[PDB]
Design a protein around this ligand. Structure first.
Ligand SMILES: [Cl-]
Ligand SMILES: [Cl-]
Ligand SMILES: [Cl-]
Ligand SMILES: [K+]
Ligand SMILES: [Mg+2]
Ligand SMILES: [Mg+2]
Ligand SMILES: [Mg+2]
Ligand SMILES: [Mg+2]
Ligand SMILES: [Mg+2]
Ligand SMILES: [Mg+2]
Ligand SMILES: [Mg+2]
Ligand SMILES: [Mg+2]
Ligand SMILES: [Mg+2]
Ligand SMILES: [Mg+2]
Ligand SMILES: [Mg+2]
Ligand SMILES: [Mg+2]
Ligand SMILES: [Mg+2]
Ligand SMILES: [Mg+2]
Ligand SMILES: [Mg+2]
Ligand SMILES: [Mg+2]
Ligand SMILES: [Mg+2]
Ligand SMILES: [Mg+2]
Ligand SMILES: [Mg+2]
Ligand SMILES: [Mg+2]
Ligand SMILES: [Mg+2]
Ligand SMILES: [Mg+2]
Ligand SMILES: [Mg+2]
Ligand SMILES: [Mg+2]
Ligand SMILES: [Mg+2]
Ligand SMILES: [Mg+2]
Ligand SMILES: [Mg+2]
Ligand SMILES: [Mg+2]
Ligand SMILES: [Mg+2]
Ligand SMILES: [Mg+2]
Ligand SMILES: [Mg+2]
Ligand SMILES: [Mg+2]
Ligand SMILES: [Mg+2]
Ligand SMILES: [Mg+2]
Ligand code: NA
Ligand code: NA
Ligand code: NA
Ligand code: NA
Ligand code: NA
Ligand code: NA
Ligand code: NA
Ligand code: NA
Ligand code: NA
Ligand code: NA
Ligand code: NA
Ligand code: NA
Ligand code: NA
Ligand code: NA
Ligand code: NA
Ligand code: NA
Ligand SMILES: [Sr+2]
Ligand SMILES: [Sr+2]
Ligand SMILES: [Sr+2]
Ligand SMILES: [Sr+2]
Ligand SMILES: [Sr+2]
Ligand SMILES: [Sr+2]
Ligand SMILES: [Sr+2]
Ligand SMILES: [Sr+2]
Ligand SMILES: [Sr+2]
Ligand SMILES: [Sr+2]
Ligand SMILES: [Sr+2]
Ligand SMILES: [Sr+2]
Ligand SMILES: [Sr+2]
Ligand SMILES: [Sr+2]
Ligand SMILES: [Sr+2]
Ligand SMILES: [Sr+2]
Ligand SMILES: [Sr+2]
Ligand SMILES: [Sr+2]
Ligand SMILES: [Sr+2]
Ligand SMILES: [Sr+2]
Ligand SMILES: [Sr+2]
Ligand SMILES: [Sr+2]
Ligand SMILES: [Sr+2]
Ligand SMILES: [Sr+2]
Ligand SMILES: [Sr+2]
Ligand SMILES: [Sr+2]
Ligand SMILES: [Sr+2]
Ligand SMILES: [Sr+2]
Ligand SMILES: [Sr+2]
Ligand SMILES: [Sr+2]
Ligand SMILES: [Sr+2]
Ligand SMILES: [Sr+2]
Ligand SMILES: [Sr+2]
Ligand SMILES: [Sr+2]
Ligand SMILES: [Sr+2]
Ligand SMILES: [Sr+2]
Ligand SMILES: [Sr+2]
Ligand SMILES: [Sr+2]
Ligand SMILES: [Sr+2]
Ligand SMILES: [Sr+2]
Ligand SMILES: [Sr+2]
Ligand SMILES: [Sr+2]
Ligand SMILES: [Sr+2]
Ligand SMILES: [Sr+2]
Ligand SMILES: [Sr+2]
Ligand SMILES: [Sr+2]
Ligand SMILES: [Sr+2]
Ligand SMILES: [Sr+2]
Lengths: 56, 73, 237
RNA sequence: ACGACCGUAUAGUACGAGAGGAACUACGGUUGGUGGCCACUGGUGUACCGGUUGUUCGAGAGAGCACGUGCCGGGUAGCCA
RNA sequence: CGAGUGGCUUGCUACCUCGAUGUCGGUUCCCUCCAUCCUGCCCGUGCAGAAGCGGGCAAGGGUGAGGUUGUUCGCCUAUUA
RNA sequence: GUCGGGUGAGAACCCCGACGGCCUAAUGGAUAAGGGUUCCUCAGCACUGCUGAUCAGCUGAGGGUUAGCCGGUCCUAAGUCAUACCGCAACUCGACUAUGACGAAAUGGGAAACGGGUUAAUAUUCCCGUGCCACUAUGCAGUGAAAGUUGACGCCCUGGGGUCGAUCACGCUGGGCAUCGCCCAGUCGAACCGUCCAACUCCGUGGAAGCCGUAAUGGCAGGAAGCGGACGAACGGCGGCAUAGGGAAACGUGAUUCAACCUGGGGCCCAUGAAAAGACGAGCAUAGUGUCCGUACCGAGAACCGACACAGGUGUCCAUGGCGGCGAAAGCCAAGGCCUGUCGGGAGCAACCAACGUUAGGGAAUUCGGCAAGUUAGUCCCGUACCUUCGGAAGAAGGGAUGCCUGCUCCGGAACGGAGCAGGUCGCAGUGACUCGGAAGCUCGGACUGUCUAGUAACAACAUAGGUGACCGCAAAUCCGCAAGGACUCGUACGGUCACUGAAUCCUGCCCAGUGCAGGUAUCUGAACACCUCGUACAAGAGGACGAAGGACCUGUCAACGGCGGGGGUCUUAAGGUAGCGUAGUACCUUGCCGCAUCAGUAGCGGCUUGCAUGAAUGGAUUAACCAGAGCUUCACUGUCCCAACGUUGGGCCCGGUGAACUGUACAUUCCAGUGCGGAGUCUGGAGACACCCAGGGGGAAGCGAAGACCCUAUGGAGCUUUACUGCAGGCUGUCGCUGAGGACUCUCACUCCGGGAGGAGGACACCGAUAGCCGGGCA
RNA sequence: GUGGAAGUCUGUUAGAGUUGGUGUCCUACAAUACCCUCUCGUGAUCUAUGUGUAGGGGUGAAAGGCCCAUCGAGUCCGGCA
């Protein structure tokens, strides 16, 4: 069984969903953690300086 | 005996399974009454079909050499 | 390279844990106030998933229903005793002090009241040899002379299930079923059969440990494989 | 677009003590190659005719399906060696 | 011992190609060379004959089937002008 | 698909009918995930659709999902999170321990709903009929109430009860067919309420010393059979429900085999097959309440994932429709669905290609190799070798039979079950299609089933049982974490960790010098702190004494890394290759030599063997069984071949419509020679050459595709190794702090461990912080 | 005779897999597909959903295999021009 097309058919699991806090479809319904805003992980909002060029 | 094992495994492995299971299934004299009606129920567990005495013993025999020693001393 | 299998173990991931949620009970001796006024009746004999040996369910006078590490020869109906004044009969538990020298015991406590640590496997037994006011000398299954506080409790008799080791597994499938009842990763791939990145013995055209197998006690994890601090090897000499 | 060989007569002759043993020429055939043709023999022939298994159309009659014929036998034209 | 020709063997060189000209052997299909194995015509012989052996002209045609081995090569078998 | 017709401006593909077909574990029915309006209606055809389009999953506009009893909701599973506590420089980080919560929509547990009717689209939800559950209120009854039971459970074999379905017999209703007299359909009717009870268990009676019983095991004076009794089942029987409903009508009755469902008996485990909420226990009447969320549709060769209306991938149940047959097999056919695995028209339709049928004689000559194809085939009877671990080998091999029809026998309660007999009879052929093994021998490897390189490797590689060695007494060995802590472990030597070999059988020799590990160690060497000397009004510093682990040195150890040669009748460096096997999957020489077999055999097998360079758990030898493993031979068979032919289906070719991509410095009708950076359509010399187009097989454009995976170069990269360089974890060891009192000692009071607790064990040690020496490819 | 064991046999039952064709395809139906042959199919079996293990780390009956078409060290953004 190939890793390509044939294995794409088994994908019918729901993981990332609309997030209650930020509105993005990044709330992982299995981990109960938003990969976009950190909801479920931290009270503070997920943020990182590498999300932009260093001197900006 | 080890006939269910067909031509597989070799002599010893199934020679022992035979003797062991042969002595394992013989009718054993119940410690309670004296009837030879004890049968294994599982690993180290024996029961008499006559009086229903359920007790512990060897894994494949109701009594082991060391087990028979305790009585003495 | 990469951490060896022995190192993956310590992390205690599912692959390496024992099926605890399936285990029955902790066969520790009952805790008596004193006097030995504790007696129970063997209500049933059960299989113990964690030891491949039988265990007995006892109902004690005061109303406690607990599984017990059963010796050979215990059956339903039989009455068991646990206390300093318990009768010297197979299946009863009492401190070594109260035990007559030359009597096989099992589930021997390491430290008084711990519940039992030694001689708990199928068909084994410790052998109480010497008594005293300060030290009870017991000979354990490995044949070593152990000095114990005479206040350490034990059960008279040998453990049930003896001889379990006399019959060969014959099939890999049988080994398999037993291994699924333990905290062990099985089957076993030889170190020599792996790539150099995976084990000290891996690598090389043909298989062979490119080094002596006797490793130092001081070796770090990842390197301590093969024959650990062997005092000797082989069958000769 | 023809190449080569075998055989017969020449001749058991010439030659040679003998053993052995030619040629010119005239013939018959084989082989390899070449071009064409189907009266003959052979192949094919899901044109066609027949036999027959399972099943469906109630039986009978007559049919469908079972892969481009269910299977088997025979085989015209045509094409072929 | 001396003098040459070929470019089928091997070696040498590093001139062409590293933004790639796909290895060996075999197979299939086509053209060619002659230093000729057979076939045609000759000369010599230690050429009676038959046959050998050596040489000359000559490239029209032919040069096949098999056993081991991937083999090329080679060894082997029965045929063959 | 075809002929008619319908609608429309327009019809091969939108609809009707007929005829012809396709799908049967699916191409039918219900659904999970996922999608998200794709569902229904009307009006449309610019877009989407492999052609067209009046059609649609497309466009426009509206509409559609109704619940006490179907899910959710409730419970807890592996396990997750939150709070507290602790760690961490710190946190959104981290382990334990408490608490709380979360965690199952087909498919875990679980209070209660059936039948019919209705709509364009919902429907156990609405409507009609009938019924049921929980809670609460009122009334009567009731003092019981929590012990127990249930929820609640593995694998294999099997009896019994029993519904649906299917089939058989006869009747009734309707249909079909028309030489017969046959063939088809229907003949209905729930939940619920009530009632019946087989099995199991137990009691009374009885009194078996050999009887009772089973498919089988089994049972009994500790009381068998027989007799009577208590408890006790179905999603089952029976009655009601039902002058409910449904049907045009009839609106059956018995039987066999019996999925569901109920209830028993047996066997297996070095394997033991959830939990909790809840329920029962614990009556009845009447009334009231039963909110909240889901509900359409697709569920796939067009509604999901794969960029697509993708030949892929994707769970559940329909596993009992008919013939067939052992069958949930093939083949054919129903119910039901479809003609959308969606472009058509034309040419006896050429070459060539993909699938495939048939080939005379020869029969593996073909080829690296029988690759491909073929041969054999189902069932019954006869019969069956070497070898063997006594299981097997084995369907060995080899031989014979096989239909139909007429009348019968036997087994069984019987089957629309099975085994035979006699007579008759047809064909080339009776497992007639379909289904359906070719067989035998020798050798190598791995014992076996099992595993693997998703996407060029299925093997001899990995695993395995078996053998062996190593570590550790549990405050352990091994391992994870910076720490708090943790896996192993509800474990305790018959254990579990670390390694090697790889079933059985017969065996497993010699070597401890080097390296590794381990133990010992008079003497030697061996750091820091403290101490002493010199030096400094002090300090830096120099030296000394003491000396831990470690090393030197000694010993043990090869199923520890590994080794077992050359020379002469010992030497390096410990020993000097034993049993076995041997030209090997190891032998260069080598196609070794002899033999077998063949017309001929670098192959294969047997023997020899001085082995370039076999050899004993780096396991040796050997071996029945097994194998999509490597090699060899034989019988049978055949278009593999001699040597090709003819035929079939789909393409190819012509026509309508649709309609890309690769590639392109320029020029370009070339050929023969030469030249040129030595491999030119383009330079030179000749030759040839009127332009354009169709089909073709691919000689050339050193054809197109990819800034060569080879090779080298770069004071390039990475993965791996080690007695490379340099370091870092980690372990061992000494010292200082924790740390107390009286080169050997006692004590208790810190501290540690055990204990529910009292208390016990230990104890200034250990743990922890700091530093010093040794080891240190585990890591950078 | 009964019994019905087995990492037991046959088997396109469901279901799992993939020896050969070096067949078809190779701007594909498909960035791993199609057909025939072949292997397993009561167990170390297959399968759905839930759940856990995370990057020098997992997971690995070991092939440097697998960790979302990529693995002798994933992916994303940043260091970074
Ligand atoms: Cl084990
Ligand atoms: Cl639902
Ligand atoms: Cl029974
Ligand atoms: K090159
Ligand atoms: Mg315990
Ligand atoms: Mg496990
Ligand atoms: Mg192994
Ligand atoms: Mg490897
Ligand atoms: Mg390594
Ligand atoms: Mg050069
Ligand atoms: Mg090229
Ligand atoms: Mg010449
Ligand atoms: Mg002459
Ligand atoms: Mg010529
Ligand atoms: Mg319309
Ligand atoms: Mg509907
Ligand atoms: Mg389609
Ligand atoms: Mg023929
Ligand atoms: Mg040949
Ligand atoms: Mg073949
Ligand atoms: Mg009868
Ligand atoms: Mg060989
Ligand atoms: Mg194998
Ligand atoms: Mg592969
Ligand atoms: Mg394979
Ligand atoms: Mg082993
Ligand atoms: Mg072992
Ligand atoms: Mg090995
Ligand atoms: Mg192996
Ligand atoms: Mg040989
Ligand atoms: Mg040895
Ligand atoms: Mg080895
Ligand atoms: Mg380059
Ligand atoms: Mg290279
Ligand atoms: Mg590097
Ligand atoms: Mg503690
Ligand atoms: Mg390194
Ligand atoms: Mg899963
Ligand atoms: Na020359
Ligand atoms: Na010539
Ligand atoms: Na040859
Ligand atoms: Na009933
Ligand atoms: Na049937
Ligand atoms: Na169409
Ligand atoms: Na198998
Ligand atoms: Na040594
Ligand atoms: Na050796
Ligand atoms: Na196999
Ligand atoms: Na053919
Ligand atoms: Na060309
Ligand atoms: Na690398
Ligand atoms: Na028997
Ligand atoms: Na295959
Ligand atoms: Na990494
Ligand atoms: Sr696939
Ligand atoms: Sr899935
Ligand atoms: Sr969180
Ligand atoms: Sr931030
Ligand atoms: Sr414990
Ligand atoms: Sr405890
Ligand atoms: Sr190695
Ligand atoms: Sr030895
Ligand atoms: Sr003549
Ligand atoms: Sr003569
Ligand atoms: Sr047909
Ligand atoms: Sr046939
Ligand atoms: Sr180039
Ligand atoms: Sr010439
Ligand atoms: Sr000549
Ligand atoms: Sr050559
Ligand atoms: Sr040669
Ligand atoms: Sr139009
Ligand atoms: Sr529609
Ligand atoms: Sr919940
Ligand atoms: Sr459920
Ligand atoms: Sr099951
Ligand atoms: Sr029955
Ligand atoms: Sr619906
Ligand atoms: Sr459906
Ligand atoms: Sr599909
Ligand atoms: Sr139909
Ligand atoms: Sr269309
Ligand atoms: Sr014919
Ligand atoms: Sr051949
Ligand atoms: Sr041949
Ligand atoms: Sr036969
Ligand atoms: Sr695989
Ligand atoms: Sr493969
Ligand atoms: Sr062995
Ligand atoms: Sr040594
Ligand atoms: Sr020898
Ligand atoms: Sr072997
Ligand atoms: Sr010119
Ligand atoms: Sr062409
Ligand atoms: Sr099997
Ligand atoms: Sr291949
Ligand atoms: Sr084929
Ligand atoms: Sr491909
Ligand atoms: Sr099978
Ligand atoms: Sr079966
Ligand atoms: Sr991948
Ligand atoms: Sr950057």
């Amino acid at each position: 069984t190939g890793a390509g097309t044939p294995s794409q058919g088994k994908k019918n699991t729901t993981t990332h969903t609309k997030c209650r806090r930020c509105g993005e479809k990044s709330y992982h319904t299995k981990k109960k953690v938003c990969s976009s805003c950190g909801f479920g992980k931290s009270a503070k909002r997920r943020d990182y300086e590498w999300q932009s060029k260093a001197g900006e | 005996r080890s006939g269910r094992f067909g031509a597989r495994y070799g002599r010893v492995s199934r020679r022992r399974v035979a003797e062991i299971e042969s002595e394992m299934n013989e009718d054993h004299a119940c410690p309670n009454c004296g009837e030879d009606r004890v049968d294994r129920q599982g690993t180290g567990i024996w029961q008499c079909s006559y009086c229903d005495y359920k007790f512990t013993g060897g894994s494949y025999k109701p009594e082991t050499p060391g087990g028979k020693t305790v009585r003495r001393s | 390279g990469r951490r060896i299998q022995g190192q993956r173990r310590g992390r205690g991931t599912s692959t390496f844990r024992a099926p605890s949620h399936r285990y029955k009970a902790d066969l520790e001796h009952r805790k008596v106030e004193d006097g030995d006024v504790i007696a129970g009746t063997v209500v049933d004999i059960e299989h113990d998933p964690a030891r491949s040996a039988p265990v007995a369910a006892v109902e004690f006078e005061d109303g406690d229903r607990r599984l017990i590490l059963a010796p050979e020869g215990v059956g339903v109906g039989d009455e068991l005793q646990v206390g300093v004044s318990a009768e010297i009969a197979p299946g009863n538990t009492l401190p070594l002090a109260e035990i007559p020298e030359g009597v096989p015991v099992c589930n021997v406590e390491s430290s008084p009241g711990d519940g039992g640590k030694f001689a708990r496997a199928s068909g084994v037994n410790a052998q109480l040899l010497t008594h005293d006011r300060n030290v009870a000398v017991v000979k354990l299954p490995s044949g070593e002379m152990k000095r114990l506080d005479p206040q350490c409790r034990a059960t008279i008799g040998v453990v049930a299930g003896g001889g379990r080791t006399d019959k060969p597994f014959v099939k890999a499938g049988n080994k398999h079923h037993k291994m699924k009842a333990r905290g062990t990763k099985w089957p076993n791939v030889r170190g020599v059969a792996m790539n150099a990145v995976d084990h000290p013995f891996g690598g090389g055209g043909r298989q062979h440990p490119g080094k002596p197998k006797s490793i130092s006690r001081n070796a770090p994890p990842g390197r301590k494989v093969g024959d650990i601090a062997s005092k000797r090897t082989g069958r000769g000499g």
